[PDB]
Amino acid sequence: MSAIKPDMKIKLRMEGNVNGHHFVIDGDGTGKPFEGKQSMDLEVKEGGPLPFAFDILTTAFNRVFAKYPDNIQDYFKQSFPKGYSWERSLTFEDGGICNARNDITMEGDTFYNKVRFYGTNFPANGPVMQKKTLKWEPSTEKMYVRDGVLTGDVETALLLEGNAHYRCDFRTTYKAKEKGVKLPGAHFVDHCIEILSHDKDYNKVKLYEHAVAHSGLPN
């Protein structure tokens, strides 16, 4: 019997600053850790309407919601009940840079998330500050160990209006709270993130993510 139930609740608070614009966003959702699926309702509480593309934030709103096969060590499920934290750099092709972190805890059937998101050096004429993004392309996260730390690299892109892509490189470090959770072997995580619904200025958003771990093969 596991600390992690087939159905778990999610409670989040994000505070952040992009190009000097302060905001606070709350989230409430549910997910299925063993199926690799989560959805959540987000609401901007302060700083709305946001003057930048909501899409830059969405990967910051937990790899516990990833379907892991038996033959890959699941570092994220093994980290509970005490939990884990991640730190992420997002590097955009036009010099925009973000730093995000999440400290994740579990109380009963609920994951609590303390999220911080800091963004700077977005050009005022670029697609983030002009709100020209449409979605993230599905991508594959490469997981590996660097200097004894579990590291995930993604090379991906935002689709823009007008048949263009805006490229972004992600690097995330993941750290169990508990001393002694064994690191996994190198592997991949396929993921897809989608905004299912939104209101006029993206003050209320429903967000969905699906993630599957694998070793790079078909069988």
Residue numbers in the entry: 1 to 61, 65 to 222
Q: Which lines from the publication concern this structure?
A:
The system studied was a reversibly switchable fluorescent protein (rsFP) which is a representative of a class of proteins that undergo a reversible photolysis reaction from a highly fluorescent “on” state to a weakly fluorescence “off” state. The chromophore of rsKiiro is formed from the Ala-Tyr-Gly tripeptide at residue numbers 62–64 in the α helix.
In this study, we probed the light-induced reverse reaction, from the Trans to Cis chromophore conformation, initiated with 2 ms 405 nm pulses at a range of optical flash energy densities (0.1–6.7 mJ/mm2) after the initial Cis-to-Trans photoconversion had been driven to completion using ∼13 mW/mm2 of 473 nm CW illumination. This is due to thermally driven ground state isomerization occurring within the 10 ms duration of the X-ray probe due to laser and X-ray induced heating (discussed in detail below). We conclude that the initial population offset seen in the crystallographic data at 0 mJ/mm2 energy density of the 405 nm illumination is due to increased thermal recovery caused by X-ray induced heating. A clear difference in reaction yield can be seen even when comparing the lowest flash energies (0.00 and 0.10 mJ/mm2), where a difference of 3% population transfer is determined from the shift in the minima.
